[PDB]
Nucleic acid binder design. Structure first.
Ligand SMILES: [Mg+2]
Ligand SMILES: [Mg+2]
Ligand SMILES: [Mg+2]
Ligand SMILES: [Mg+2]
Ligand SMILES: [Mg+2]
Ligand SMILES: [Mg+2]
Ligand SMILES: [Mg+2]
Ligand SMILES: [Mg+2]
Ligand SMILES: [Mg+2]
Ligand SMILES: [Mg+2]
Ligand SMILES: [Mg+2]
Ligand SMILES: [Mg+2]
Ligand SMILES: [Mg+2]
Ligand SMILES: [Mg+2]
Ligand SMILES: [Mg+2]
Ligand SMILES: [Mg+2]
Ligand SMILES: [Mg+2]
Ligand SMILES: [Mg+2]
Ligand SMILES: [Mg+2]
Ligand SMILES: [Mg+2]
Ligand SMILES: [Mg+2]
Ligand SMILES: [Mg+2]
Ligand SMILES: [Mg+2]
Ligand SMILES: [Mg+2]
Ligand SMILES: [Mg+2]
Ligand SMILES: [Mg+2]
Ligand SMILES: [Mg+2]
Ligand SMILES: [Mg+2]
Ligand SMILES: [Mg+2]
Ligand SMILES: [Mg+2]
Lengths: 65, 102, 61, 89
RNA sequence: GAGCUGUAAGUAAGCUUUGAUCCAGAGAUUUCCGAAUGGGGAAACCCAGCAUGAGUUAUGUCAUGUUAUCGAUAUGUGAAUACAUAGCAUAUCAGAAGGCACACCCGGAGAACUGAAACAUCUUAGUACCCGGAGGAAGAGAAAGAAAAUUCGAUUCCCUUAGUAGCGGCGAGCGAAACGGGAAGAGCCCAAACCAACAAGCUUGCUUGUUGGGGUUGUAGGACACUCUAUACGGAGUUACAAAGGACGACAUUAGACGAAUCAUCUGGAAAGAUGAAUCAAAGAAGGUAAUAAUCCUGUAGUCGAAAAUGUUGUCUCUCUUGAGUGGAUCCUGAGUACGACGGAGCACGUGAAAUUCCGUCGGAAUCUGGGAGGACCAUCUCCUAAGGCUAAAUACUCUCUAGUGACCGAUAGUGAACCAGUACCGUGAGGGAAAGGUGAAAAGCACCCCGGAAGGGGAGUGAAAUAGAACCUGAAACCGUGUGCU
RNA sequence: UGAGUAGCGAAAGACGGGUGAGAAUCCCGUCCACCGAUUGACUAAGGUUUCCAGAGGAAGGCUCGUCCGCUCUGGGUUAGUCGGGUCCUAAGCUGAGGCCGACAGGCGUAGGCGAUGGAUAACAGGUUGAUAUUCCUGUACCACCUAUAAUCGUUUUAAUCG
RNA sequence: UAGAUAGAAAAUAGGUGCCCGUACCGCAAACCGACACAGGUAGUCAAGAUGAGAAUUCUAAGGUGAGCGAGCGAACUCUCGU
């Protein structure tokens, strides 16, 4: 998910998306550990999604001040 | 590079000097290109690898980009390339005919 | 770190000289005396030189 | 933070014997304590934890070519379940 | 503007013209240690208080913030001791701390080997080292100057004076300055007299203190008295001379864009070489490309370009701000100062006939009819006006960035380090401190067969070359082998 | 070069059967021998993965090597009660204010830090290739928390804390 | 005791209890000695016969055969017996 859609989302939606993305990342890591993950690029994709979500959240809580 | 994937070029230096072919890959960081039918190498392929069958495989090796020259679309002569700006877009121009390469 | 509270008078360095002009380092110390004066409107015992005390220019209280 | 507390499961012969004993082995963040590990496992897998043992493993010297180095130090927790089960696969 | 997920090959999974990768400006994140600052500690660890929150029935657990010391400024309380003074407590502060560029600057403290053919005065040397303080420069600086003529007019720095004058167990050695020629230039503010307001002593005389005005000097100046001139007209300014801002513009820096002109044959693996015939040039700098290229590529001359940030600047704004003259009645013009003695030090000058300047100790002026200097000292003459402060430039240096240069090195050289080097290694530690570059144009890096467990080799093949096959360009000598003509 | 020379670092091995390209040297067996106030079992320092399993035989191993403390691959260390911290202090170190000192800094009070000492609750058995007072079985103990409580208290108190 | 406050708890039931170390060598081939080095390295346990004994000799529990060998059986050197 890109920064444009992230900015479309609302703050509560940003937090929920961060939670679900972190849960997905955890599941991906566990599959990788157990040897059940072939599509390894998903880990990096989700990591960058989380980074973008947090970036937009920080932008909002900065511009509020 | 002034030569681009898919371009039709003439080899102006090398064993294949005088041959014409299509550019099927470019290596910007090495200033090299791969041209169909140009610079064929015979590599020893082990059948024991992931490919069962083995032997001597013939394939094009990359050539230095300054050894190929674009062909003028009108005259079909090798030509250098300039650039024009048409409605704010860069256009490759053959310096011999003035046409647009692509 | 000893000097006159009033003027900053402090020790200096120089030479002791023999009759044959041999030289060794020595100090000239100030003639400091521990006196009670008014510091910031309150009594306080500080180091003051005899010369800074001379002619009653410092009030001892 | 539970998903940060737990890093990955450990799959070895000793760890498989433990799993037969209802003990699940994880690599965990090197800074967390036994209680945090217990709470993270209970939150993520919805189980009841009987106990947690924990241990540290030093960085291990490792060589590749002419370059000498070390593996990351590890913190390994062994969680004995009271109720429920964990399916790693 | 087409590829990309570093060195770094491989595989995998992916991204990208709906513009990746990549380049520049700005922003976000930025674990732990470290001045390290809640406390402790054997750095990168451990253990807490307080507030708020998460979680639990609750405890245990967790998250965020905060909590060092000193300094300064406020507030409360306040011992011996009455008043209040220590003290204590709370609050605020982009206050300090620590680092380094092994450079340059100022200062504190300060050797020795060495030279003197010994050595002590002297020298090395106010050097090395240590310590404090900086700044982008520092230091100095608007005459108590230099001088001795038609005098000059702050300071600094360069040339010269000059290895002169001098100093010196008159040994070794040390060694000016003025003048003259240059770089660069810039001049200012206080203290005091006096005036007004305020407060204490309450003569409630007018003394002291704070604030503001005034004033700033040698041609003596100022106060004071008087006469003109103006409330920003003018003038000045954040580089001193007072101190903060704002608007617009210009230029520059940090990515980039365009950018002329060559074909053929021979040799050769390959042409840029040779040969023949052309072309461009404000471009014949340079690097690369299969050998040596102005015209193949990247470039070069030239021209163009900035969303954003930064820097330097111009004009407006803003801010501040009177400027001259006459008079000599009175007043002011830097005090434990100048200066002297004793003891040191600094001055090129070693105490000397020793001025000129600083320190310790002790003594201790004058007040414009004053005071200082012209190398003891006195007189005369002349030049200055100390005991308060500020001040750009010309000067020094280079950790660093950008663009370049060299009758500088070319792998035992050049950095210690061309390479994963302050590494390996050595040492308790401070510290010492290496060796080590080159396949090929391209990896085309030797399919396959044979002997061998492998290593290694012989073919085959790639390649111009493998007698270029992996520390793989060339491959000297020492040294070690095999064969052999003569002996 | 010396030179195929000196040396190969205290000692008792023999044979059979395996393995393997290769065996005096590896594995297994029998017999023999050696230490046994110990060459045995723990354990503090110190070291820091050398530990276990599978694989290897270039180099290291003073020979050899099929083997190894070596090389490769993957593993292994579990605590309320054991030792240390969330307890105590000795020497010593440090040290707000403070005293002293050209600078740097030295000394030092309150206060801290600091075991080699004081205090302090778990034992037996079983188990792996590699850990075990740590895992498992059985049976305990210590501190704290929540609920229900025989009983006692209920503002000079009188139960309770201190 | 000074002080603090309505509330306290014998018992019963249930629950909570962190961080560091823990491998292995450790009179040694893993430590200090440049070495798989006849040296050095605190403490605990330590059986039988004999004996005063932790001496002595031989054994136990347990561990070990020592990381060059095979011959020969000169001088000489060393260690040992007469
Ligand atoms: Mg543990
Ligand atoms: Mg001499
Ligand atoms: Mg001499
Ligand atoms: Mg200055
Ligand atoms: Mg061109
Ligand atoms: Mg040609
Ligand atoms: Mg060549
Ligand atoms: Mg004197
Ligand atoms: Mg004088
Ligand atoms: Mg004279
Ligand atoms: Mg004059
Ligand atoms: Mg200057
Ligand atoms: Mg070198
Ligand atoms: Mg060479
Ligand atoms: Mg070198
Ligand atoms: Mg060659
Ligand atoms: Mg060679
Ligand atoms: Mg011999
Ligand atoms: Mg011999
Ligand atoms: Mg021998
Ligand atoms: Mg031996
Ligand atoms: Mg082993
Ligand atoms: Mg060997
Ligand atoms: Mg102090
Ligand atoms: Mg102890
Ligand atoms: Mg064991
Ligand atoms: Mg253990
Ligand atoms: Mg053990
Ligand atoms: Mg001993
Ligand atoms: Mg005995």
């Amino acid at each position: 998910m890109k920064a444009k859609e992230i900015r479309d989302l609302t703050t509560s939606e940003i937090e929920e998306q961060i939670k679900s993305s972190k849960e997905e990342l955890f599941n991906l890591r566990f599959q990788l550990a157990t040897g059940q993950l072939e599509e390894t690029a998903r880990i990096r994709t989700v990591r960058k999604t989380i980074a973008r979500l947090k970036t937009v959240a920080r932008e909002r809580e900065i511009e509020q001040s | 590079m002034h030569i681009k994937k898919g371009d039709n070029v003439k080899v102006i230096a090398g064993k294949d000097k005088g041959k014409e072919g299509k550019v099927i890959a470019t290596l910007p960081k090495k200033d090299r290109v791969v041209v169909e039918g140009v610079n064929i190498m015979k590599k020893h392929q082990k059948p024991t690898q992931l490919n069962p069958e083995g032997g001597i495989l013939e394939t094009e090796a990359a050539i230095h980009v300054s050894n190929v020259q674009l062909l003028d679309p009108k005259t079909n002569e090798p030509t250098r390339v300039g650039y024009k700006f048409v409605d704010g877009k860069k256009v490759r121009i053959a310096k011999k005919s003035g046409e647009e390469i692509k | 770190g000893k000097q006159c509270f009033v003027t900053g008078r402090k020790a200096s360095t120089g030479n002791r000289r023999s009759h044959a002009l041999n030289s060794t380092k020595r100090r000239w110390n100030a003639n400091l005396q521990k006196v009670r004066i008014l510091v910031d409107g309150k009594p306080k015992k500080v180091w003051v030189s005899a010369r800074a005390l001379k002619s009653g220019k410092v009030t001892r209280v | 933070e539970a998903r940060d507390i737990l890093k990955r499961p450990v799959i070895t012969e000793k760890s498989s014997e433990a799993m037969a004993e209802d003990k699940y082995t994880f690599d965990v963040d090197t800074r967390v304590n036994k209680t945090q590990v217990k709470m993270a496992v209970e939150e993520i897998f919805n189980v009841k934890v009987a106990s947690v043992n924990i241990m540290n493993y030093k960085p291990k010297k490792k060589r590749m070519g002419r370059y000498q180095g070390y593996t990351n130090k590890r913190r390994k927790a062994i969680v004995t379940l009271k109720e429920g089960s964990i399916d790693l696969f």
